[PDB]
Symmetry: D4
Subunit: 110 residues, 8 copies
Amino acid sequence: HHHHHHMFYEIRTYRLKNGAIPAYLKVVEDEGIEIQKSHLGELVGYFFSEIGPINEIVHIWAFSSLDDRAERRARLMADPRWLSFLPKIRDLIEVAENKIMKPARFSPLM
Amino acid sequence: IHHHHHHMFYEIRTYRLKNGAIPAYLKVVEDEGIEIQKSHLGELVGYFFSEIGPINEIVHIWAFSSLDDRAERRARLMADPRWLSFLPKIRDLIEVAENKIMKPARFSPLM
Amino acid sequence: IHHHHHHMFYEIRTYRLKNGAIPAYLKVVEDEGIEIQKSHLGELVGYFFSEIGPINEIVHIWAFSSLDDRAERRARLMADPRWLSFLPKIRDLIEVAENKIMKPARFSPLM
Amino acid sequence: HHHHHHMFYEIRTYRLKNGAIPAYLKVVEDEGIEIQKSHLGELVGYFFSEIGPINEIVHIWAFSSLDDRAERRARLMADPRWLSFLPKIRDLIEVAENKIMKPARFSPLM
Amino acid sequence: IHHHHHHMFYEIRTYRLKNGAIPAYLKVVEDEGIEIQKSHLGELVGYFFSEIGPINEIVHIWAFSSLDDRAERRARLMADPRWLSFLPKIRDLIEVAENKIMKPARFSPLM
Amino acid sequence: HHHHHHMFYEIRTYRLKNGAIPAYLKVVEDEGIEIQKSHLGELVGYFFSEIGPINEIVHIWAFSSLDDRAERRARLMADPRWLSFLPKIRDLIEVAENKIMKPARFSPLM
Amino acid sequence: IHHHHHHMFYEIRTYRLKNGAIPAYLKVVEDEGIEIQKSHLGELVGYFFSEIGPINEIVHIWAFSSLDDRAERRARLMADPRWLSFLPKIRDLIEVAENKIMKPARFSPLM
Amino acid sequence: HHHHHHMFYEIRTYRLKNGAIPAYLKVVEDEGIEIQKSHLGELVGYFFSEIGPINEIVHIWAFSSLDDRAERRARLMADPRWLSFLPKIRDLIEVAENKIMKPARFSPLM
């Protein structure tokens, strides 16, 4: 029920400190996202709450395999630029979770 | 402001299926449902099933230019007897469901 | 004190229905249940079904002058064979349910 | 299963810092609610916990359409008076969520 | 230490029933189950059903002198064909269940 | 399915700051519980975690009716001694909820 | 780094069963399923059922040298008609399920 | 459906302060785990998040009986070395829970 060649989609969901969405999005835009992209490779989407959970961030990344994901994230974590960035969001995120999902055969994101 | 002035709204729909129902669900959606659903709702962004995390989960994402337009589209979907005749094939496969509306960050490739 | 001395108590009842059951539920409640239910419980405040958020959700709200009066009203509701004969038509449509009692803020239009 | 002409009901539910209901209700009454009403238009109800979740606020607003809701909330967020008010509740709210619901045909709130 | 040295352990068992099943459940437990259950488990502390909060909920509480004794008692309960023949009458009325072990505060009347 | 004359049981469940059970139980024992009992009337049980949720308090009170409960709690909240006590637990409790339950006919607590 | 460079990945699978289904589930898994499952997935670490906490719960844990290897193993499991013919015997006993991947601490005996 | 002679497995799950896994694992390794093992007796496994809940610790201990567990934990709690250690993780853990589980007959951990 999925195509032979397909990407894996990681969905990361964060609940932020109440009111922190603007500050979080600013520092990620200005400093974090380009570092993150440079290691992880395919940012799919990056969203914030409007109706539903409030103070929520959802971001989605595509990976050719989970071993490749692991290698890429390890390089990200070892990057001094990322380590310098992290304190700027570490206390804005309260609770976090991730999942890996696969595309249906009819998903436009394959 | 922390989003672009002109942007799409993203609806994320998350279903927990009856245990073991993913293959049956995806089959009948592919063969009998998704073209009808797209023909009303418009821009399907992505359609996923779970591998690590919640098991038996479906997530699908749609983009809309406004929530009033979303509303008009869903009304047409729900009034279409071609869709109402399809729904019985998945509505017992789905146990629990939720949706949310989110906006894209300025740096989201999905704008 | 952060509420008016004389005020009503608000009961908010939230149900998660069987997936896809909202239209059937609302039909039979309208046609066969709500007048009987109101005739015991009294002041219905609002009765809603979900659009964005939890799917398959019903929320209904009732106002009472006291919780002892609420109790007496619900006892009469539950003893009425006209209501007990109605309940089978929704009790399998409802999967999960909860209620809570809340008080109005001083600036609530619902006092 | 709803009337052709009807309002949309937004239900906002907040879990506050333990013990914060009195302080929250005071500052909302004294400063926030009139600003909020002036932009949003139809406050329906505004409630706090008694039996159930403790430290909870539930407030309900009616809107003629979700596009109208969006316009109104944007004006609220741009109001310097609201921006000055927000710090007074931003740290009293811990967790928050909202939903949009529609009235049944037999709802007294239509 | 924040409890008395000699104290009982309290097991709190919480069930969510099938919607509307409380009256049927309580009837058959009263008539056919609770005496057998007590005869193995010992000291029933309290047995409650919900009014405001979660709906369709049962909470029952048992006291034990030790958790090894609890274990031996539950093993005997589960081995008794009189109990295994009773269980079918409630096991489909119960949807979801959990238990926890708690200790009494020094100022708890239940010691 | 309950006896005509019966009490109502309020079950209050608190999740505390991690590690706070000892400190919480000490100050409640030394200062709070006697004040609380004096207004509320029938403490049934007062428990803390051992296996299950960690950092949890569960306490149970019996009331002849919910209107009587309301009157008693109002007097408790107006007692300067209780108002002086509350700051000593207000920040030890993180999340809280209550429910009202009724006794089965075969409950030893009736 | 807070783990050893060479380590296994641990998958923890948690199921909530139909109330009262643990004995039936464990019987048929023992007799008809676990050897087939092990023959694809490899290193079973532990397989548990609940006593205090969530009731009707199964937790099983598997170790993998890499997530790509896990993926290849699960694909082979799901393609095996011997496993697909076994699944009907548990897939209605399981109500809700989730999995997670965790790494061992440096001081974990499971490395 | 379990073997006559078998161990009980305690599974302890903690959600930490966001970003705290490295610091937590360091202080547990350097100071806490040897004290803990010395009283509790059979550490089975000790894990941290990778995909699923983020900021999560799961640790598993085996006990011959729950009375033995109780005795061992009481000695741990009375150990001045453990009492000196606890402040170093008390505020890194936000939410915690434990459960006791039994091994299936075919579990390699018996």
